Amino acid sequence: MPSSASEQLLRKQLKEIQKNPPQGFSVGLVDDKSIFEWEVMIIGPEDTLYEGGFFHATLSFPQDYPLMPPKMKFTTEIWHPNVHPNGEVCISILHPPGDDKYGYEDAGERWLPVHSPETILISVISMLSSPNDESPANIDAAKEFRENPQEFKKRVRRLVRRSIEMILEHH
Amino acid sequence: MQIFVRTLTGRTITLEVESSDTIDNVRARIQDREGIPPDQQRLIFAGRQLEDGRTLADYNIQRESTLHLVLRLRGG
Amino acid sequence: TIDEGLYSRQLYVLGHEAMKQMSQSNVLIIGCKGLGVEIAKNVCLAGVKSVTLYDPQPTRIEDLSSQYFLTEDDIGVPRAKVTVSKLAELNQYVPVSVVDELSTEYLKNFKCVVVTETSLTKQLEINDFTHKNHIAYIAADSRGLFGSIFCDFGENFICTDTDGNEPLTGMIASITDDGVVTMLEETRHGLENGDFVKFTEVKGMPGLNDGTPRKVEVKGPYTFSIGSVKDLGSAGYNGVFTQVKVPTKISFKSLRESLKDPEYVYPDFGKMMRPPQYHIAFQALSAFADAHEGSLPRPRNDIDAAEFFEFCKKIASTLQFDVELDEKLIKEISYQARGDLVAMSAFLGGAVAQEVLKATTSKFYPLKQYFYFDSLESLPSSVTISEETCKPRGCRYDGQIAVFGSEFQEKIASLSTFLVGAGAIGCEMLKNWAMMGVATGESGHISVTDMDSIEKSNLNRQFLFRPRDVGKLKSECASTAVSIMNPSLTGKITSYQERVGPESEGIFGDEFFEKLSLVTNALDNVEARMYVDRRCVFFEKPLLESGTLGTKGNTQVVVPHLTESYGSSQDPPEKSFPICTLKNFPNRIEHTIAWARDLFEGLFKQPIDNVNMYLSSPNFLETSLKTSSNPREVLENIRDYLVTEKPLSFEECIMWARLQFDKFFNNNIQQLLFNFPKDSVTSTGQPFWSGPKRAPTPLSFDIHNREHFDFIVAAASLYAFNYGLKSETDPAIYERVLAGYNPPPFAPKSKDKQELKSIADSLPPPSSLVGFRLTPAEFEKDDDSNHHIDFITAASNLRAMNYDITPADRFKTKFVAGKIVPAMCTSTAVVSGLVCLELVKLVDGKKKIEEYKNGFFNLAIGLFTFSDPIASPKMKVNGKEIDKIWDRYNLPDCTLQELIDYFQKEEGLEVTMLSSGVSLLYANFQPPKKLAERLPLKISELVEQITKKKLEPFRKHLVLEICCDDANGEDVEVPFICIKL
């Protein structure tokens, strides 16, 4: 049995990202068993609330990729309005296609088959820098960021520390 | 000139197109007013499926020509 | 009271009102040969008031070329009398009858008249009366590889729905008093001239919000006019238009006056010049028949062809038809005049059957008016086609032999086919094969596989199945059914009940595929189609693919070393929604339905499985503490469902359900509002609850409210189903328990090592509850008595009431929640026809790609279109051409190192990356630490290691794919590799 278009595209994209890796994140497979399950380690962007932090995530690609977007889940504990408590990232570029219903959000702003995994990750970086309050996944985080951003600042920094102590786990 | 792109649903799209315009150009415009990517569009004219890299002229698509925007279906 | 259990999938195509009209419409069908019976079959399954057959002519053997309801024992019997009993069994809500004589006054009993196998002269008689009394008229005939359909619904036929599409809609920006409407920033209205639109929420002139539709006048892509509205308001804005589907007058010409100037429906713009030729030829067939006592020109008879050719000249002159007659093309009709192909009948019959429904429902746009069709590319060329070979014989395949010849029949007979799917398309396909005489020969065979069983819903478009066959396997019943249609297939068909996929490669393996002539799909999902495609690419076998959706359908053919494969292209994916939208911010009913489904699973399934796994698995607790997304919810599920919230009476389930109401439609909404007050504002000035967001409102329980009570019963009944408690319908009991319910006061809330999950200790041990299991609710749309759809609908609409969304009845909810695909017999018959018209091209072994044809159609609008398959991508390497799709490398089970060294100079390409399936075997960017480890391993060993699975014994090959760069820097995609073990 030959390979689908999905498998071929992931190879070429895995090769390209793991050729000239854009700084800020590292990309690899959870297991060579499957190229449809990437793990991603993200450095907390400079100057942002998360700087110094080290966040691990998982890009799960669907069988019919790139018709559908991948799902990104933070495994590292994180506190963000656009990140569900279970870890799932919720941003526009990862929303399924497309237009409809009443004519608010267009098809060109969500997922497109052309968006490389690199394009996604870059979008999730900027998400950490500047939260989008039009799509909150964590209600509690969405409030604290608005009504007392100095206790939100505090809680993030606590989770930034706990991420470093988990790097020490490699022992 | 002017062409027509009728969908399998019955919707008719009219387009002011140059005889020099590429099929890629046309596919891009149809995405911008229906919301399906080019690689999922299937355009047909006079019994042949339009391929990228060519132009309307390569298929002799003159004025009042009608293209059919079709798709494959999954039911059985 | 229309049987929703039966007509479900069809209702989602036609609608209830259309079907009411149908059940009040009588249909007369003239002629019960190949074409007639197909039309009748579909109309019967569709569900009209009654079907009347007229065909007193006795059954001849050559009729069996496509009349699948006629057997050889029925020879000499009037066809209509034989057919009626078979057709009656199709639909218990449709009576079928026969008439021995017709009269013009008798036609008044019918809403639509179908005419097959009738002369032009008698057609004119019939149509003159029906057109005069405004009775729908459809004439259709199948002649070899040529087909014709004529429709006439009267001079004053009204169409209430021209395409079945949902009413268009868009948000308004502004409306001048002069009447020029403008959409929001960069939004197309998609309207067209003549369309009618109403308005709502238009601020500036509330008069347009009346509902009065206005004629649209398109001015541009973003604007359109409706007329001067200077009467009220100087300027409007921030409104919403909505298309009003207006009844459309369709003025049909009679058959008499339209014979001179016929309006054409072109099924192929590539053959634009052909319909006029056929318009004369089909009349010449009638003129010829009158001049030979009803007999058509004999097969490939040159004499009759020339005589036929002269009739065309006379008719062309008399009608003052100024067209230059194509002699080659015209004589081909004579040569194939006595041709009766099942594929052609299945194609035309489906199309015609749809048209009958149009005439009776005023829904969908009819054919206006002449539909001339040919599949002439289907004609063989690898065999002799002459007067001798096409000579009739005493066998049933005469109607087919009359076109393809006797030696071509041998090729069809010796075919070894694989049919994937015994559903709607599967049934029609097996029927066609039976008629064609596929696999009837000694070396021929049919393998059909389908793991699904027959359901009541299926009987509406799967005609090989009957009401009593419900519960049985589709593959077995489909086989037994066609054995009756063609006993030659007795012992020639093997039925499997296997899901086609990786799991079943042991059964559908190397030996299975190698003896196949071709594969045919009849699938209902894309994943399976892709899989079969790739297997067919490996074994270099042809693949016939087809699919449907309501009145839409398509056909694709995959030819080895010629065309691209099914996987070479993709189609738009199924619509889905993100959790963030669903959990708190719904704005469609589809959002609340999806939410309601997760709620159904969350209450009556997911916690139940955790309980049952806790009691059945020995190390479940600490295993879930280690390897679960959310160990917390698992434990809280065990506790709540085994001891805390466990009911002891059904009245406690009512108490429970009353509590769930507050939890999901009240308290949670209060909590959401406390986090995002109704007057909240995001950091851009805009109010939070605006646009796609809709400010919700808590719900105060009210037993006298319809939807509130519907939820309690559904929820409580389902909760009882988990613990095996008996439900109660008597509303008196609910009133009692609910009256004595005091809602606990709820208020919106504002070194760890906080593992407070020592509550697993508060759980009784599995040893304390040996042999105790809870019953999880497995979502089943098609059972209307299990409270599943009831719950979804109630919960969905309660949440719809929260967020000010228009609720939906269980019918729409059942469609969405169930992910039901609209489908009816008509489109399924049509695709089955086109597929078989392509199959005969594969049998002929046609090497020209332009001979093949991919089909696409919509019966709702009489749209047919075809196209040449795309050729497989080529790539000349080192000299001659290689096929990127079909060609392969055949190598030994060597080592990874010497495999890379094989492409070193044998091809001149560095293997930058190597994979097997979804598994990455090697990549040049991988660390040298495991490169040196995995380089000296055999592929067979290397694969078994990475996949953590040992190669199965039946596996004799192994497929690898590689990315390759030429000595230059850039990549070059290359054919795949087949490793022999």
From Swiss-Prot, chain A:
<feature type="active site" description="Glycyl thioester intermediate">
    <location>
        <position position="90"/>
    </location>
</feature>
<keyword id="KW-0067">ATP-binding</keyword>
<comment type="function">
    <text>Catalyzes the covalent attachment of ubiquitin to other proteins. Has a role in the formation of chromatin structures that influence the localization of transcriptional silencing factors.</text>
</comment>
<dbReference type="GO" id="GO:0043161">
    <property type="term" value="P:proteasome-mediated ubiquitin-dependent protein catabolic process"/>
</dbReference>
<dbReference type="GO" id="GO:0061631">
    <property type="term" value="F:ubiquitin conjugating enzyme activity"/>
</dbReference>
<protein>
    <recommendedName>
        <fullName>Ubiquitin-conjugating enzyme E2 15</fullName>
        <ecNumber>2.3.2.23</ecNumber>
    </recommendedName>
</protein>
<keyword id="KW-0833">Ubl conjugation pathway</keyword>
<keyword id="KW-0547">Nucleotide-binding</keyword>
<dbReference type="GO" id="GO:0005524">
    <property type="term" value="F:ATP binding"/>
</dbReference>
<dbReference type="InterPro" id="IPR050113">
    <property type="entry name" value="Ub_conjugating_enzyme"/>
</dbReference>
<dbReference type="InterPro" id="IPR016135">
    <property type="entry name" value="UBQ-conjugating_enzyme/RWD"/>
</dbReference>
<dbReference type="Pfam" id="PF00179">
    <property type="entry name" value="UQ_con"/>
</dbReference>
<dbReference type="GO" id="GO:0005634">
    <property type="term" value="C:nucleus"/>
</dbReference>
<dbReference type="InterPro" id="IPR000608">
    <property type="entry name" value="UBQ-conjugat_E2_core"/>
</dbReference>
<feature type="domain" description="UBC core">
    <location>
        <begin position="5"/>
        <end position="165"/>
    </location>
</feature>
<comment type="similarity">
    <text>Belongs to the ubiquitin-conjugating enzyme family.</text>
</comment>
<keyword id="KW-0808">Transferase</keyword>
<dbReference type="InterPro" id="IPR023313">
    <property type="entry name" value="UBQ-conjugating_AS"/>
</dbReference>
<dbReference type="GO" id="GO:0000209">
    <property type="term" value="P:protein polyubiquitination"/>
</dbReference>
<comment type="pathway">
    <text>Protein modification; protein ubiquitination.</text>
</comment>
Swiss-Prot record, chain C:
<comment type="function">
    <text>E1 ubiquitin-activating enzyme that catalyzes the first step in ubiquitin conjugation to mark cellular proteins for degradation through the ubiquitin-proteasome system. Activates ubiquitin by first adenylating its C-terminal glycine residue with ATP, and thereafter linking this residue to the side chain of a cysteine residue in E1, yielding a ubiquitin-E1 thioester and free AMP.</text>
</comment>
<dbReference type="GO" id="GO:0004839">
    <property type="term" value="F:ubiquitin activating enzyme activity"/>
</dbReference>
<comment type="pathway">
    <text>Protein modification; protein ubiquitination.</text>
</comment>
<feature type="binding site">
    <location>
        <position position="525"/>
    </location>
    <ligand>
        <name>ATP</name>
    </ligand>
</feature>
<dbReference type="InterPro" id="IPR035985">
    <property type="entry name" value="Ubiquitin-activating_enz"/>
</dbReference>
<dbReference type="GO" id="GO:0016887">
    <property type="term" value="F:ATP hydrolysis activity"/>
</dbReference>
<dbReference type="InterPro" id="IPR032418">
    <property type="entry name" value="E1_FCCH"/>
</dbReference>
<dbReference type="GO" id="GO:0005634">
    <property type="term" value="C:nucleus"/>
</dbReference>
<keyword id="KW-0479">Metal-binding</keyword>
<keyword id="KW-0547">Nucleotide-binding</keyword>
<dbReference type="GO" id="GO:0006511">
    <property type="term" value="P:ubiquitin-dependent protein catabolic process"/>
</dbReference>
<keyword id="KW-0067">ATP-binding</keyword>
<comment type="subunit">
    <text>Monomer. Interacts with the E2 ubiquitin-conjugating enzyme ubc4.</text>
</comment>
<dbReference type="Pfam" id="PF09358">
    <property type="entry name" value="E1_UFD"/>
</dbReference>
<keyword id="KW-0832">Ubl conjugation</keyword>
<dbReference type="InterPro" id="IPR033127">
    <property type="entry name" value="UBQ-activ_enz_E1_Cys_AS"/>
</dbReference>
<feature type="cross-link" description="Glycyl lysine isopeptide (Lys-Gly) (interchain with G-Cter in ubiquitin)">
    <location>
        <position position="575"/>
    </location>
</feature>
<feature type="binding site">
    <location>
        <position position="500"/>
    </location>
    <ligand>
        <name>ATP</name>
    </ligand>
</feature>
<feature type="binding site">
    <location>
        <position position="9"/>
    </location>
    <ligand>
        <name>ATP</name>
    </ligand>
</feature>
<keyword id="KW-1017">Isopeptide bond</keyword>
<feature type="binding site">
    <location>
        <position position="450"/>
    </location>
    <ligand>
        <name>ATP</name>
    </ligand>
</feature>
<dbReference type="InterPro" id="IPR032420">
    <property type="entry name" value="E1_4HB"/>
</dbReference>
